[PDB]
Design a protein around this ligand. Structure first.
Ligand SMILES: CCCCCC/C=C\CCCCCCCCCC(=O)O
Ligand SMILES: CCCCCC/C=C\CCCCCCCCCC(=O)O
Ligand code: NA
Ligand code: NA
Lengths: 278, 279
């Protein structure tokens, strides 16, 4: 009985193995830069997006998926539907997925559909989708999957260091956080348990910030041998491999992987950004 | 051989007969003050004597949490691992005292595995967390693994209650954010927030329809009820507890359920006729 589908909004990256699996499906967000309106799918190559961001003087804007396209993704032959979305504190994607479930039941009746508020972004959503699959392979019931994945979400922590925080700041995703000292100061950012962004540390220069971020991850992680560590990078794979090396010096994980940022992740992480989740 | 672990629960958390007979569960008592009378909340305090004293006293009851020194002493024993389950940190100093007791322990003695769980609940909410600790230990998990699994359960755990008399919680500052209703026979359906505070979930006219609405609230929030234990605490109204149990069974199936009489602390704040439901 593998009658299930894992729906993830487009911010959550897919590894090549997940793309070849068939059980993972994306629901794409929208991206708007000046007078260009794009859909965050696999037809939007990262370089063209980064080049458009670089030329546009105006900050990029994004839009969550509509409830109707969530509902359409629920309507299929799979018995159990699991939805993984951006943090509800950072995007309307969660509320839209929940509304799509209400629309589905009005048009088609009851179905086992659960929407997971990742309280995170990017590879945070990826790891949750992988956790759903792991639970399904272990033979859990639908409600057992929900409980175990919601526990993993509670254990999961997100961290990131960017070169350019302006897109998150201008789009209202950094409210409360204090902003200009040394020009090479790099804040180490992270999630809160509620799914908002906070500042965890700071360092002058990228090399020192990556070390401090590695320390922050290691200071919070528990039972790391049971967990997969994910790293998303925006056009800086050698920086991603260095972060992986720093983290391996500090704790042992079950496994780890590195992925390129999705369209939404690229828009908000910007050129040179690094996101770590475990 | 020494016991591998002990679960310390403050006296608000009721023990089932099976837990009372298990030396792996141990209470740390709170204090109860009603007019000129001071009681330790332990098994030697009869609920009827407490209820009769409350009924006669025009003065509202007062309570006190355990001291950090008392918690520290409870940690110093032959059991290897110590788990502590306390009242919600937002409703009592019991959690802060247990954490301070741990800090004092590590300063005075060799390092020991001690973890304090903020239940963000009360009464059988603490009971079920203590049972979950035992379940995780029986599953063979490590200390860190037990801690992480129990904290996940705590986030899942929701508390609901309907009382005949909310005055003790109100007078003692435990309903700070809730608007009080004017006195036909409207009964508010109260419950926990994820932070461990009390909120009003619903309201109904009469006790019978209040229990129905509470049962609806429990059913609306519960995840994977089939694997969970549902607990019902009642203060001198066992038939009301069995009716609530019946209403919940109409809405979802659980692995098992139990009913217990309220502890001393739970009795003081739930009062005669109170009902508490946790799953
Ligand atoms: C709570 C932890 C968040 C970690 C953020 C990591 C940095 C960049 C990843 C992309 C974050 C995107 C957040 C804003 C998405 C808004 C999309 C929309 O609804 O328009
Ligand atoms: C957060 C959910 C709370 C549910 C409350 C259920 C009603 C009665 C159970 C007893 C509650 C006791 C709370 C106050 C305890 C204060 C003890 C102290 O003096 O520190
Ligand atoms: Na559309
Ligand atoms: Na008084």
């Amino acid at each position: 009985d593998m009658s299930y589908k894992v729906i993830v909004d487009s911010c959550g990256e897919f590894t090549p193995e997940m793309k070849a699996d068939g059980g993972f499906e994306h629901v794409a967000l929208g991206i708007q830069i000046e007078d260009t309106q794009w859909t965050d799918d696999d037809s939007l190559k990262q370089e063209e997006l980064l080049l458009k961001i670089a030329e546009s003087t105006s900050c990029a804007k994004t839009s969550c998926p509509s409830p109707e396209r969530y509902m359409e993704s629920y309507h299929c032959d799979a018995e159990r539907i699991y939805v993984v979305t951006l943090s509800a504190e950072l995007s309307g994607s969660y509320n839209s997925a929940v509304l799509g479930k209400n629309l589905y039941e009005e048009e088609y009746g009851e179905k086992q559909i659960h929407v997971f508020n990742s309280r995170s972004a990017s590879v945070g959503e990826t790891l949750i989708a992988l956790k759903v699959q792991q639970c399904e392979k272990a033979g859990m019931t639908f409600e057992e999957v929900v409980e175990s994945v919601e526990c993993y979400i509670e254990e999961q922590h997100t961290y990131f260091v960017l070169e350019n925080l302006d897109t998150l700041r201008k789009n209202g995703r950094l409210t409360g956080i204090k902003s200009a000292g040394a020009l090479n100061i790099k804040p180490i950012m992270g999630s809160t348990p509620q799914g908002t962004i906070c500042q965890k540390e700071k360092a002058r220069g990228m090399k020192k910030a990556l070390v401090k971020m590695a320390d922050c991850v290691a200071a919070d992680v528990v039972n790391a041998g049971d967990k997969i560590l994910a790293i998303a990078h925006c056009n800086c794979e050698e920086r991603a491999k260095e972060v992986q090396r720093l983290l391996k010096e500090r704790f042992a994980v079950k496994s780890s992987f590195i992925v390129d940022t999705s369209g939404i992740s690229t828009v908000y992480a910007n050129d040179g950004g690094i996101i770590v989740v475990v």
